[PDB]
Amino acid sequence: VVSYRVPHNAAVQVYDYRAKRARVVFGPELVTLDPEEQFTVLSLSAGRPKR
Amino acid sequence: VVSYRVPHNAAVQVYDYRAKRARVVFGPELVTLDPEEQFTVLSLSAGRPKR
């Protein structure tokens, strides 16, 4: 089972596409992805200033 | 069966040409194409600014 430890002041989002249900979790916890959730890919700006 | 996971804030459109019916879906879901739906090909502008 794929599990990710969420940072203390961050949040992640996945979706249970089999049951057609969304859920958003926050804080320092682990996300237990059931057989068909996929994390939200956030492509963010970074670099020296920002890319 | 061909299935595509729709992004969280995006939408896709297909058509059931056998039953002559259209449907539009949104949000983070999977589209289950029955034997004769075809996705809408959106050729959009991109490039460095826009092509």
Check CB contact under 8 Å for B29 and A38: no
Given phi > 0 = left and psi -120 to 50 = alpha, else beta, which region is B21? beta
A17, A23, A37, A51, best to mutate vs chain B, most B CBs in 10 Å: A17
Min Cα–Cα distance to chain A from B34, Å = 17
The DSSP line for A1-43 is: --EEE--TT-EEEEEETTTTEEEEEESS-EEE--TTB------
Method for this entry: cryo-EM
The Cα–Cα gap between B36 and B49 comes to 36
- Using CB atoms and an 8 Å cut-off, which of residues 9-48 of chain B contact chain A? 28-30
Q: Which residue's entry shows tokens 């682990």?
A: A30
Indicate the residue type of A1.
Answer: V
Check CB contact under 8 Å for B30 and A17: yes
Task: Note the resolution in Å, 1 decimal.
Answer: 7.9
Q: Are the CB atoms for A40 and A17 separated by under 8 Å?
A: no
Q: Are the CB atoms for B37 and B17 separated by under 8 Å?
A: yes
The Cα–Cα gap between B20 and B13 comes to 14
